[PDB]
């Protein structure tokens, strides 16, 4: 397995002009490994009982040596997982990477779905108000089929049984992640990476000396920033309301998911029909999947240059990003008619600019 190590991470030859925007994959992998370490060492002291989970998490912070550090590293590294993934996705929307990296793009989408599931399962385990009512909402959202929801819950309502199986599932999924990562990289190195210029070039250079050092530099920056936020708390990434014990008969008066879930939340606020809600997610994900075979949707021969530099027309990916940010903004606010109106405007933009990527 050493010979493979050398073939793929030492003698592998890249293009000279790979700048930082091509370093974020490595970064998400590293946040995965790190999150796994802190996960396992958190599991050694966590209690999976509805009667006492909350106090179990508080015991780590209050009465255990370095107890606070692992919880906070685990909490904060999640945000960086998602931030790095979104940068990593947008880079390849910008470049039209999926033109020839077909199966890599598919694998990517599967990994993103895995990550969403993993995060949301994690989000229930500390067992506060937000955890209980979030679980209630998302389980009610997948109700269309009889008996599936009491079965997956384990029970007529969110329960200790639900906590136990969420804990086991959150244990298992990351490692399935890892396996799919190996699959991802297989498809990638089958083809070879693209340039920022989107041309084919013979001016290649080996990995170990030049690109490995850039990977290391960015890694230093990321470790830095994680520790900064973890130790000092600069930003209010997580809302305070998960600090309150659960009550099964009273909701919290103000509700804000974790930031990486706000856009979705915005949709659930503005579309009238609940099924329309769910279908928007399904449709957008199907549209992203459809990009894998964009070469077939037209008989003009395709190029990777999108000529977005100096261009007054901008590009659909940029409009997508700004629409998504606008949806995050509206996600965060209270339900009111005007917020809903601009919500619907932004939602139409978000859907249309995704549909239109296929129309070259």
């Amino acid at each position: 397995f050493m010979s493979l190590f050398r073939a793929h991470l030492v003698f592998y030859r890249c293009a000279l002009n790979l700048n930082s925007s091509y370093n974020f994959g490595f970064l998400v992998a590293m946040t995965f490994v790190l999150q796994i370490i802190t996960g396992i060492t958190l599991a050694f002291r966590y209690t999976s009982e509805a009667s006492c989970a909350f106090a179990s998490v508080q015991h780590l912070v209050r009465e255990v040596a370095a107890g606070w550090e692992f919880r906070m590293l685990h909490a904060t590294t999640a945000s960086f997982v998602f931030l790095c993934i979104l940068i990593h996705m947008t880079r390849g929307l910008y470049n039209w990477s999926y033109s020839y990296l077909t199966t890599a793009w598919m694998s990517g989408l599967v990994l993103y779905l895995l990550t969403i599931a993993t995060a949301f399962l994690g989000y229930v385990l500390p067992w506060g108000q937000m955890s209980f009512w979030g679980a209630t909402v998302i389980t009610n959202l997948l109700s269309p089929i009889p008996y599936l929801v009491p079965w997956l819950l384990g029970g007529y309502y969110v329960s200790d049984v639900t906590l136990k199986r969420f804990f086991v599932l959150h244990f298992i999924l990351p490692f399935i992640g890892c396996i799919i990562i190996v699959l991802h990289i297989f498809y990638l190195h089958l083809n070879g990476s693209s340039n920022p210029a989107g041309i084919d070039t013979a001016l290649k250079v080996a990995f170990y000396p030049h690109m490995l050092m850039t990977d290391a530099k960015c890694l230093s920056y990321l470790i830095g920033l994680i520790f900064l936020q973890a130790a000092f708390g600069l930003m209010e990434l997580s809302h305070p309301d998960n600090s309150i014990p659960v009550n099964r008969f009273v909701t919290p008066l103000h509700i804000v998911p974790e930031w990486y879930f706000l856009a979705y939340y915005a949709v659930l606020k503005v579309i009238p029909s609940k099924t329309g809600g769910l279908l928007v997610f399904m449709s957008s994900l199907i549209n992203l999947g459809l990009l894998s075979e964009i070469r077939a949707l037209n008989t003009r021969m395709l190029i990777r240059q999108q000529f977005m530099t100096r261009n007054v027309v901008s590009g659909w990916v940029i409009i997508w990003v700004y629409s998504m940010i606008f949806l995050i903004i509206i996600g965060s606010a209270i339900p009111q008619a005007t917020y809903i109106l601009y919500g619907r405007l932004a939602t139409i933009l978000y859907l249309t600019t995704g549909l239109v990527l296929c129309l070259y």
Partner: protein
């Protein structure tokens, strides 16, 4: 094409295009037309 091993992505292409046509039809019926017929 002849002499190529990719055989399962074309099927997924057709299924996806199908499914989007489906979803948009149903969404037009659900979110717009049925209410519209209450306003007509």
């Amino acid at each position: 094409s002849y002499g190529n091993g990719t055989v399962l992505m074309p099927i997924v292409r057709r299924v996806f295009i199908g499914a989007l046509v489906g979803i948009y039809a149903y969404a037009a019926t659900d979110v717009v037309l049925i209410p519209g017929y209450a306003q007509l």
